[PDB]
Structures are given as structure tokens and as C-alpha cells.
Scaffold this active site. Sequence first.
Site: not given
Ligand SMILES: O=c1ccn([C@@H]2O[C@H](COP(=O)(O)OP(=O)(O)O)[C@@H](O)[C@H]2O)c(=O)[nH]1
Length: 454
Positions: A14, A329, A344, A347, A349
Site C-alpha cells: 500500500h 522488477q 502470480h 495487479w 506485476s
Molecule cells: O523481486 C521482486 C518481487 C516483486 N517486486 C515488486 O513487488 C510488487 C508486487 O506487487 P503485486 O501487486 O504484483 O503482488 P503482491 O506482492 O502485492 O501480491 C511489484 O511492484 C513488483 O515490481 C519487485 O520489485 N521485485
Amino acid sequence: PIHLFLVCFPAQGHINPMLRLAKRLAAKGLLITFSTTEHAGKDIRQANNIIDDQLTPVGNGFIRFEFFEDDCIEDDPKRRDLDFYVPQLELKGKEFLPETIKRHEKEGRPVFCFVNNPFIPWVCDVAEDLGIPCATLWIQSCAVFSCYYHYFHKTVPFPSELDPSVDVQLPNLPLLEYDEIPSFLHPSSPYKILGTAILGQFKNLSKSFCVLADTFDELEHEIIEGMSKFCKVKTVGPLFKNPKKADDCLDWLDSKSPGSVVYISFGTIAYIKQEQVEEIAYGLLNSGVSFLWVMKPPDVAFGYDLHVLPDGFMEKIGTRGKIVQWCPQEQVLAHPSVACFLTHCGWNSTVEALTSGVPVLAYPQWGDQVTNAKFLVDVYGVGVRLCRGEAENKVIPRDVIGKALVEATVGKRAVELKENATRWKKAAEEAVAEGGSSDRNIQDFVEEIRKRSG
Ligand SMILES: O=c1ccn([C@@H]2O[C@H](COP(=O)(O)OP(=O)(O)O)[C@@H](O)[C@H]2O)c(=O)[nH]1
């Protein structure tokens, strides 16, 4: 001169998107105050170089921080339970907001608008008290926003305890099966409390004149217009994509051929089964593909057994496979060496993949991931479905994983998925550019704040 007070729920998923809203809003010549609890705000303090409320310049504007205590100890396990912490935040938030609005008006920099989070809808209650307009930031798709809205208002029958397999047909949306709606809304879901936490904002939605969504018009045009009579939704995304850092991940990808590396990531929360990790490893091993696998250690609160790779997997895998615990990422998805993206379907990603032009392999689990995976495979035409979520309770075998890795790398279907992903990349980049659909909506947002002050 316009001062905006942004309040955020104390969670990483968030805080980061609301920070992007702060940067996009401050760049338009605005003073943005970012607010959250002290236990979460201290992470932002040591991440940057702010230890007080010093103005950090962001373009034509500034960003300052302001944190309020929640009466919990430093590493309180009580925060992990939302049934307690959601009302606890309302208790400590309702007594901090009014005293800082009156002081900001005393110091000559009064607050013109509130921006909150669905997990803290009491900000809209406070905004009505002080006579200050409020808006709500929504870091899910508008298609998912439509799902929660129509579930709360009972517009159509939803999966119930007696009828758990019924479809859900919402306006301007494809037909969703019972496991395709946000999983938190299913009566057999183990995370109903997360659904109740999101649905609390819909009891209060009237007190926010508009909702800001992290998406763009070209992606969900039919859905944004369909929600107009129910709620003014303004697209301001992709928020992560700058309108106008490094690691050993990019250094490794520089050595690989373009469109030949498979990026694997399951987010920050989802932890898949060990048997599924075994099948994914053998899938990458026998398919002969190059991959960058993010194996993020789970938070120690859960009694999760650490994922183990098969015996000699990383040895049979040569220089063509890289295991890490974190990677930028956004920079990895933009690398030309990346072919596809086993995700996975979170949103963030999902938006990052579409903005980067990377076809995906949908492996959802819970929440809005099952709804994002549906649009990725059946609407946006950029994905290859691997599973239907955690409720399916099925391990995907190695051969099926193998066929999908090859389906997204070589063959006729790979070229089609890449061409659709490229077209979505042009739409996403145009939206945040100067004059794009999302940038103009940000300008219209600052305009209505100026119009509502008198
Ligand atoms: O090794 C990693 C894994 C995740 N992320 C970031 O973590 C977030 C993951 O949020 P998402 O809503 O896709 O899934 P959540 O982890 O909230 O369930 C995204 O901004 C990705 O770019 C990242 O920067 N590096």
C-alpha cells in the site's frame, strides 16, 4: 501552494503505490504530505534521507512526511490481525488527523484535499467533518473495483454458501466463473477478513468525490464508463512508469540473448507449494530455457517451510539460470533479454508486465490474482494460463509447465502474444506521457481540488 494530505495503510503493497501518487501529484507544483503510522514510516525514513518533516523537492513541488503512533510496541504481533488493527488505526487516526489539519491552517499551509486507502475509510469520515474533500486511491483494476462494488450492493447473485459455483455477469466484463471473481469474496475462502477490509470502503464511498485507479483508459475503457453512474473513477496509471536502481540481475541479463530469459516471480506474499516448486524446476530444466527466478523468503510469522530446489538442479542448470531473493522488477521487465514472465498475477506485476510488453504465464493464487489472470489470458490476450488459483489445490506437473514455457518462447503463439504485449506497451506509455489519458486525468484531479476550495 495547494497542499494535499495523503494517508496510507501501513503495508508495503500500500505504501509504494501511494508514494507514486505523491510523486505524480507533487510534480504538478503541489505540496504533498504522506502520512502513515510510525512503525511503517520509519522504513521510509531510512530508505531515503528524511528524519523529520523536511521538504523533499519533487519536480515543481515538494513531499514531506508525517507519522502518527498506533500505541503498539515496536514489533507488535497485534498488527498482524486485521480484526484488531483496522479499528485500532481508526482509533489512533481519528485523533491525529483533526489536530494536524488545524495546525496546518495555523501555519499558512492548509490542506485542500484528502487521499486515503480503502483499508482506512475513516479518513473519508474525518474529511467530511472538517469540510475537506476526499478521494480514494485504488491499486487494483477497475474490473476488480466493479466486482467489489456489485458484491457490496448485491447487483447480481454472487457465490454464496448454498450456491458456490454460480457465474457472475457484471456490466462491461467477461463472464466470470465462481473462482474467477476476487477470491476473498468466495464463501469458502480462508481470507474473508481481507475481503471485509476492502468492503469497508464501500459503506463510505459517498464521502469521496472520486476514486483514483492505477490503470489507464485503453486497458479498461468499457469498465470505467460503466462505473461512471456508480462512482467517478479516474485512471492515473501506470503509476510506476515515469512520465519523462541497478543490481546483479541486470548485469546477468546483459549477457543473455534478447527474448530468451524467463522471469519468475510470485510477489511479496504468495508462497506456493514445495511440490509445485519441484515441478517448476524440472520444467525449466528439461525445457532448456534461460530463467531468472525470484525465490523470496517468506515472512517468519508463518510456519512456512523454506522452498528447496531438487537435488543437483542448480548444478545441471549452468550459467543459464539465476536464483535471487529480490530484483528491480521494473528494470528486469524492461530488459530486452526477457522472453516471458511467470507471475502470480498481482495487479502491480500485471500492470508492470503490460507496460513493459512482456507476455506472461498466469499462475494466480488468491485475491484479485484470479481476476487479473482471467483478463491476461482471455481479455488482454497476452498470457498463457497455468493454474486457476489456490482453491484449485492442484500441482501443475512438469510436462504441462514445460509445454507452456515453450509455448511462450518459440512458435507461432509466442509471436502473437509478443505482438499483443507490444501494443499494450504503446498504450500504457502514451497514457502517462505529456497529454496522455492518465496524465490529463491527474490534471483534472488537481483542477477539481482547486474548484472545490472556492
Ligand atoms: O523481486 C521482486 C518481487 C516483486 N517486486 C515488486 O513487488 C510488487 C508486487 O506487487 P503485486 O501487486 O504484483 O503482488 P503482491 O506482492 O502485492 O501480491 C511489484 O511492484 C513488483 O515490481 C519487485 O520489485 N521485485
